Amino acid sequence: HRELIGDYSKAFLLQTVDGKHQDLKYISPETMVALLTGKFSNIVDKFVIVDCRYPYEYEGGHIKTAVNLPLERDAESFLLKSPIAPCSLDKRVILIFHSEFSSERGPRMCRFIRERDRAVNDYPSLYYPEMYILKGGYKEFFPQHPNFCEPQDYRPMNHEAFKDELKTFRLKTRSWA
């Protein structure tokens, strides 16, 4: 009972929960685990978990199999230089973006990739028609499913010991207010 995925080919596969960006689709930690455990494997050929946090955050504990792509230029290169395509036409590729709380950084990246994907395709085709945000980010995922994380820990962006690493990262970004 929702709208189609972004190339209007079919419905969203995963059950979604409410999130503050009302036009994006959010999933729970339980759904993320369903992907990781192959619950959807007959249909989902590939999925990419895009950890949008800074490298020190990712190094302090991330979801197994996640890729750390906090800079837009790096996310664009990884995802769109040579798009990640299912090995059967019957099957799907899904992207899941998250950040610490999935408040700002994850949603931002999700939108950016959609804008890029639209730009490089003939409307309405997309390389990544089906993208989700992990509701509550790493902060909510880790306490529920620690064995799906490595290392089994959680390093916040504003960790007191990583103030320098935060500044170092910010000076690599393409724009700030």
Ligand X SMILES: N#Cc1c(F)cc(O)cc1SCCS(=O)(=O)O
Q: Rule CB under 6 A: which residues touch ligand X?
A: 6, 23-25, 110-111, 114, 118, 131
Q: Which residue is nearest to ligand X (CB)?
A: 114
Minimum CB–partner distance for residue 8 and ligand X (Å): 10
For ligand X, the closer of residues 24 and 48 by Cβ is: 24
Minimum CB–partner distance for residue 50 and ligand X (Å): 12
Minimum CB–partner distance for residue 136 and ligand X (Å): 18
For ligand X, the closer of residues 5 and 63 by Cβ is: 5
Pair type for strands 92-98 and 44-51: parallel
Extract the tokens encoding 78: 């990884």
For ligand X, the closer of residues 4 and 85 by Cβ is: 4
Rounded Cα distance, 112 and 72, in Å: 7
Contacts of 87 (CB under 8 A, 6+ apart): 45, 46
Sign of dihedral through CA atoms 96, 47, 6, 8?
A: negative
For ligand X, the closer of residues 25 and 135 by Cβ is: 25
For ligand X, the closer of residues 49 and 110 by Cβ is: 110
Minimum CB–partner distance for residue 116 and ligand X (Å): 10
Cα R_g (the chain), whole angstroms: 16
- Is residue 131 within 8 A of residue 21, CB to CB? The reply is no
* Element housing 111 (H / E): helix 105-119
Minimum CB–partner distance for residue 149 and ligand X (Å): 25
